[PDB]
Amino acid sequence: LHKEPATLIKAIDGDTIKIMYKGQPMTFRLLLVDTPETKHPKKGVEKYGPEASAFTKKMVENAKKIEVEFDKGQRTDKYGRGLAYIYADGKMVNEALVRQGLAKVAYVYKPNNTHEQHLRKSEAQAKKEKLNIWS
């Protein structure tokens, strides 16, 4: 797995960010994490939804460099969204959200599950600290 440079275009939700990748605007979905949504299909603006959303947004908007890291499996989902680990200044956005109890580790689909263990380790820590979602 390789990190590739990308440019922020706009944060959309806790789990979705629009980025310029290899010169193309693309919507990216954060791999392996589910955050509460402000959009969400059925639901709507669930609890911690606005919180996860502001977290992702501040973190990617205040970064000097954003990098995209594809997993070993398919790289887009059925909506055309990129499936990646997103890094802000060397820090993985997907892990940061899980470490703060602002996301749960998702339904996992091999072979896109390389950082599954790391994330689960951060999820257990946030639960144990009883943070946000976990309180």
Coordinates of C-alpha atoms in Angstrom, one line a residue:
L1 CA 0.0 0.0 0.0
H2 CA 1.2 3.4 -1.1
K3 CA 0.1 6.9 -0.1
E4 CA -0.6 9.3 -3.0
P5 CA -1.0 13.1 -2.9
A6 CA -4.4 14.6 -3.3
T7 CA -6.0 18.1 -2.9
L8 CA -9.0 18.8 -0.7
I9 CA -12.0 20.1 -2.6
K10 CA -14.7 20.0 0.1
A11 CA -15.7 17.9 3.1
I12 CA -19.3 16.6 2.7
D13 CA -20.0 14.4 5.8
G14 CA -18.1 12.6 8.6
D15 CA -17.3 9.8 6.2
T16 CA -17.3 11.5 2.8
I17 CA -15.0 14.0 1.3
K18 CA -14.6 15.4 -2.2
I19 CA -11.0 15.5 -3.3
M20 CA -9.0 16.3 -6.5
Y21 CA -7.2 13.0 -7.4
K22 CA -4.8 12.8 -10.3
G23 CA -6.5 16.0 -11.6
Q24 CA -10.1 14.7 -11.3
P25 CA -12.7 15.7 -8.8
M26 CA -13.9 12.6 -7.1
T27 CA -16.0 11.8 -4.1
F28 CA -14.2 9.6 -1.5
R29 CA -15.8 7.4 1.1
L30 CA -13.6 6.6 4.2
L31 CA -12.8 2.9 4.3
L32 CA -13.8 0.7 7.3
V33 CA -15.6 3.3 9.3
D34 CA -19.3 4.4 9.7
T35 CA -19.9 7.8 11.2
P36 CA -23.3 9.1 12.3
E37 CA -24.8 11.0 9.4
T38 CA -26.2 14.5 8.7
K39 CA -27.5 13.2 5.4
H40 CA -28.1 9.5 5.8
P41 CA -30.6 7.7 3.5
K42 CA -33.6 6.9 5.7
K43 CA -32.6 8.6 9.0
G44 CA -31.5 12.2 8.7
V45 CA -29.3 14.1 11.1
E46 CA -28.4 11.5 13.7
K47 CA -26.7 12.1 17.0
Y48 CA -23.0 12.9 16.8
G49 CA -23.6 13.4 13.1
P50 CA -22.8 17.1 13.2
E51 CA -19.9 16.3 15.5
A52 CA -18.3 13.7 13.3
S53 CA -18.8 16.0 10.3
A54 CA -17.1 19.0 11.9
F55 CA -14.2 16.7 13.0
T56 CA -13.5 15.5 9.5
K57 CA -13.9 18.9 8.1
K58 CA -11.5 20.7 10.5
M59 CA -9.0 18.0 10.3
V60 CA -8.8 17.9 6.5
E61 CA -9.3 21.7 6.1
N62 CA -6.4 22.6 8.4
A63 CA -3.9 20.1 6.9
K64 CA -0.9 21.0 4.9
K65 CA -1.0 17.8 3.0
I66 CA -3.7 15.2 2.2
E67 CA -2.8 11.8 1.0
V68 CA -4.9 9.0 -0.3
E69 CA -4.2 5.3 0.4
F70 CA -6.0 2.6 -1.5
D71 CA -6.5 -0.8 -0.1
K72 CA -5.8 -4.1 -1.9
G73 CA -9.4 -4.6 -3.2
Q74 CA -11.8 -2.6 -5.3
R75 CA -11.1 1.1 -5.2
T76 CA -14.5 2.5 -6.0
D77 CA -17.9 1.5 -4.6
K78 CA -21.2 1.2 -6.5
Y79 CA -21.8 4.9 -6.3
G80 CA -18.6 5.7 -8.0
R81 CA -17.0 6.8 -4.8
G82 CA -13.3 6.2 -4.1
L83 CA -12.6 3.8 -1.2
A84 CA -9.5 4.8 0.7
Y85 CA -7.7 5.6 3.9
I86 CA -7.3 9.4 4.0
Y87 CA -4.3 11.0 5.7
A88 CA -4.1 14.6 7.0
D89 CA -0.5 15.5 7.7
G90 CA 0.5 11.9 8.2
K91 CA -2.5 11.2 10.5
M92 CA -5.2 8.8 9.3
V93 CA -8.6 10.5 9.3
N94 CA -10.3 7.1 9.5
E95 CA -8.5 6.2 12.7
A96 CA -8.8 9.6 14.3
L97 CA -12.6 9.4 14.1
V98 CA -12.7 6.0 15.6
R99 CA -10.2 6.9 18.3
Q100 CA -12.5 9.8 19.4
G101 CA -15.7 7.7 19.5
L102 CA -17.1 9.6 16.5
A103 CA -17.3 6.5 14.2
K104 CA -17.7 2.7 14.6
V105 CA -15.5 0.2 12.6
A106 CA -17.7 -0.9 9.7
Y107 CA -18.9 -4.0 8.1
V108 CA -15.7 -5.4 6.7
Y109 CA -15.2 -6.7 3.2
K110 CA -12.1 -8.5 2.3
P111 CA -9.7 -7.9 0.8
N112 CA -10.2 -4.3 1.7
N113 CA -9.3 -4.8 5.4
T114 CA -5.7 -4.1 5.9
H115 CA -6.0 -1.6 8.8
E116 CA -9.0 -3.4 10.2
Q117 CA -7.1 -4.5 13.3
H118 CA -5.6 -1.1 14.1
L119 CA -8.9 0.5 13.9
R120 CA -10.6 -2.1 16.1
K121 CA -7.8 -1.4 18.6
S122 CA -8.7 2.3 18.5
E123 CA -12.4 1.5 18.8
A124 CA -11.9 -0.6 21.9
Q125 CA -9.9 2.3 23.4
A126 CA -12.6 4.9 22.7
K127 CA -15.3 2.5 24.2
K128 CA -13.1 2.0 27.3
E129 CA -12.8 5.7 27.5
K130 CA -16.5 6.0 27.0
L131 CA -16.1 8.8 24.4
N132 CA -19.0 10.4 22.4
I133 CA -20.9 7.6 20.7
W134 CA -19.7 5.3 23.4
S135 CA -21.1 7.3 26.3

